[PDB]
Design a binder for this molecule. Structure first.
Ligand SMILES: Nc1ncnc2c1ncn2[C@@H]1O[C@H](COP(=O)(O)OP(=O)(O)NP(=O)(O)O)[C@@H](O)[C@H]1O
Ligand SMILES: Nc1ncnc2c1ncn2[C@@H]1O[C@H](COP(=O)(O)OP(=O)(O)NP(=O)(O)O)[C@@H](O)[C@H]1O
Ligand SMILES: O=C(C[C@H]1NCCC[C@H]1O)Cn1cnc2c(c1=O)CCCC2
Ligand SMILES: O=C(C[C@H]1NCCC[C@H]1O)Cn1cnc2c(c1=O)CCCC2
Ligand SMILES: [Cl-]
Ligand SMILES: [Mg+2]
Ligand SMILES: [Mg+2]
Ligand SMILES: [Mg+2]
Ligand SMILES: [Mg+2]
Lengths: 476, 469
């Protein structure tokens, strides 16, 4: 059973919910975690979604090695794990476990690209990534081993690369909004928060109401021509001139599962969106074994599986129905089907939806279509409710004085900002100092969706003219 | 374009082939290779196949960590990679990269398995593995980081575990034989080649005609109860007693790709079985509007098609490129074909050309594709059987090895003998060792007089021997 209350004791709730739901088992190495089926299946669902979508844009998959020579990695960091020996035997030079794959992939890109006919080059990989994170580890959200994909592309023009950046970013919106029912906000990173290797970083950001924190959900970079300068990725154009390629890179990790847990979970435990749940409907026979009820459960299973609904009968002998209800509630199965002798006599079954608790009486013949409609309802309502908590979590302000009260209410702040890089630094400091007295607030993104900006408007901090609205907050 | 000859220098043919098809790029860390799309997509076909099949047996995927603490791994190896630092700082204790995951998975098993209600427990994972191999590395066949799937299961009885050992091994036969059209022999490992932590090790074995080497294609172990005792994987049975569990484990790797390549490849380069080819039919314009219509048509039949309508290459360049890459069928369309209402079609395995009318394409291309696949397999099976010699005594071995053959020979199954045979064969080759590949499930009759071909003692079973990877 789940006992820590979600609003009151968020950290404990989260651990309880991931452990008692059977998603995660703890492990003797810090910041590493076991991903059990109930979590891993969700990762498979989103990997297949995204993979299929990039295969439509002409991206192709590859696998580069997890190892990189120190020489190659330090070409141009305290997080990098170094291998120094195998068995008893010292290596000639230490070797790094990949923390990201630029220094592995880009030298190969310099070899493969010779001519404009080689462009665009579009690759992705799925792989694990290792980083010795300094911060407190958190399962899914921050781990020292995480799973991700990483895309790297090279184009003859900026315009084509930018088109891809945005197309990929829309797929990350989809990953989170369409599969996980988490609402996100597309936006440009500030100068201080963007990938230092690139020209412009775009991002998809999320908000955890229960601790008032923003969190970057995924990232898509327009890298410009600078890696191609560094690594010498050049092409003869059709006029025989030597040109630099234009590059993008993008990634999203097992962090997304965690954001999904935090968003839809409640005091009983998980709530998993139907699109990604391992089991969408659990059949629970009201049994404390004559074979009439399980006979009908099996029948119902077959029937529902014909509509591609994922189903499990919990036919365990030694557990009471109510025990089982709770069990599958902690796991967040979006739908429970109850079948007892009553139900068996009526030709009906009783269905309870995990998001709201609402119960329904449904005739055997209507089950398949009615459970499909219920899952669309559940999926959609999870989203709409989270969207509403997102927009209730953002306070629009005009002045630096509105900042601290807005952070204390566990809110994000949306504010007109001059975008001067020095100012971002000043605001990280000033809100750090002010937080200790009573923690740093930073930029999360400049939203693509800009609320209106009355002609005279001034920066909430410097009072200079204000370019755009920037979304700020405490963050992971 | 490929210039080395497969029957003349095999190593350089292989290198050329996997490089010029754009399957493999070489890398500065020895034993490690870049898998490009053309090779990665074939891995994706066989992974999706096996994955779906183990799902129907109730197996579920997971992901355990790639690190394992010194203490846990060094519990009861020169190949294991050790992490000792983050940035410049050293760790309290060093930490190993997963060479296999018994030591990572089995403590959590001991904790999740309490009763018989919790059995069978069936998990699998896809990951990479790192092993600092001392042998000569070879792309795919033997690499320092390789990709695999490792399956690990726990059962109440040995019967049920064993049942599962064989289901999985049939799935590996299917993986090699149905997807990749590589023929394989199911078998038992001898006591000297079995996984030392298990009871029995079953295997499927493949063969490389051009260097006479056998090669383990995949493996599936009846672990018995010995890991259960060591990790404390006990459960409460029906009667209420504390029973150890019965375990299996099994794995297959990217080595499968290299076996496929070496089996079907020829002097012009790769030949890819239709069942695993990302592109089955490449359409080449030599017009563009009909190419589009034909593609649409062929996809109705689920045929995977690419039109190579890239203007920056000559049609000739395209014939050679898709050839080296092993695309099964190539379809050529000019002005003369356009006005005849037909297409010229060339199959990659035999070079045979067909003239096919637009209406008959989908059914005929489907016919040819089943023929390619059926035929790759069948030639490879005949090539396999021409490579194994039934023998009776030891005096036959060296000549058979020099013909680059395996030998099937009756054996007492004394472990000390296999050891002796290796050294002996080592020494006569110096003047190279031959080991057991497997005891085939398919045993020929053993007449009662018969003697072990080496030691002169009464034989037990027929055993397959040769050099190997
Ligand atoms: N330790 C981690 N565990 C899980 N997901 C992660 C982790 N670090 C980064 N991510 C995700 O991976 C995405 C791209 O990685 P990357 O851009 O390299 O991260 P980053 O910029 O270093 N984020 P941060 O470390 O907070 O500064 C990020 O947007 C995160 O959503
Ligand atoms: N270095 C490697 N690269 C690629 N595939 C491998 C490698 N080593 C083993 N395999 C394959 O993966 C399967 C599972 O590994 P495993 O059986 O534990 O290896 P092994 O017993 O150490 N083989 P070997 O090193 O030849 O004695 C093996 O049976 C091989 O089919
Ligand atoms: O990983 C990236 C860039 C890029 N890699 C591909 C997808 C994600 C995208 O952010 C950023 N990054 C984060 N963290 C680190 C590095 C680093 O480049 C370099 C090694 C030190 C740790
Ligand atoms: O890994 C296995 C057995 C088993 N592991 C699980 C799946 C594959 C199956 O063969 C054998 N093995 C091979 N090589 C090594 C080990 C080892 O156990 C232990 C570490 C040293 C290198
Ligand atoms: Cl330029
Ligand atoms: Mg970081
Ligand atoms: Mg950062
Ligand atoms: Mg080995
Ligand atoms: Mg061995």
């Amino acid at each position: 059973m789940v006992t820590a209350k979600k609003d009151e004791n968020f950290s404990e709730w989260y651990t309880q919910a991931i452990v008692r739901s059977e998603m995660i088992e703890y492990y003797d190495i810090s910041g590493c975690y076991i991903m059990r089926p109930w979590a891993f299946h969700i990762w498979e669902k989103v990997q297949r979604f995204f993979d299929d979508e990039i295969k439509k844009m002409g991206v192709e998959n590859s696998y580069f090695p997890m190892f990189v020579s120190r020489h190659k990695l330090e070409k141009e960091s305290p997080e990098v794990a170094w291998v120094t020996h195998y068995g008893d035997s010292p290596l000639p030079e230490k070797i790094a476990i990949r923390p990201t794959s630029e220094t592995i992939m880009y030298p190969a890109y310099a070899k493969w690209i010779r001519s404009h006919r080689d462009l665009p080059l579009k690759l992705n990989q799925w792989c694990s990534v290792v980083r010795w994170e300094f911060k407190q580890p958190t399962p899914f959200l921050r781990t020292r081993e995480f799973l991700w994909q990483e895309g790297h592309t090279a184009h003859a023009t900026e315009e084509e690369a930018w088109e891809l950046v945005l197309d990929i970013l829309e797929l990350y919106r989809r990953w989170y909004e369409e599969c996980l029912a988490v609402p996100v906000i597309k936006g440009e990173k500030s100068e201080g928060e963007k990938f230092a290797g690139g020209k412009k970083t775009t991002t998809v950001e999320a908000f955890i109401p229960e601790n008032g924190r923003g969190i970057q959900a995924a990232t898509s970079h327009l890298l410009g021509t600078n890696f191609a300068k560094m690594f010498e990725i050049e092409f003869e154009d059709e006029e025989g001139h030597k040109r630099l390629v234009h590059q993008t890179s993008w990634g999203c990790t097992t962090r997304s599962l965690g954001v999904m847990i935090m968003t839809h979970g409640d005091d009983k435990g998980l709530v998993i969106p139907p699109r990604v749940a391992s089991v969408q409907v659990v059949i629970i026979p009201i049994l404390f074994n004559t074979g009439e009820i399980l006979g009908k459960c099996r029948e119902l299973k077959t029937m529902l599986e014909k509509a591609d609904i994922r189903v499990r009968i919990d036919d365990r002998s030694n557990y009471t129905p109510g025990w089982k209800y709770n069990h599958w509630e902690v796991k967040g199965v979006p739908l429970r089907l109850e079948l007892g002798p009553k139900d068996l006599a009526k030709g009906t079954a009783r269905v309870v939806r995990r998001d709201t608790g609402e119960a329904y009486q449904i005739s055997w013949a209507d089950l398949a279509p009615k459970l499909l409609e219920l899952m669309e309802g559940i999926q959609r309502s999870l989203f709409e409710k989270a969207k509403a908590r997102l927009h209730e979590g953002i306070e629009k302000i005009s002045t630096f004085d509105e900042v601290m009260p807005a952070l204390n209410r566990k809110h994000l702040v949306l504010a007109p900002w001059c975008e001067d890089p020095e100012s971002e630094e000043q605001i990280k400091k000033e809100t750090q100092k002010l937080s200790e007295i009573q923690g740093a607030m930073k930029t999360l993104c400049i939203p693509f969706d800009q609320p209106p900006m009355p002609e005279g408007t001034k920066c909430f901090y410097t009072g200079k003219p204000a370019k755009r609205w920037t979304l700020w907050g405490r963050s992971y």
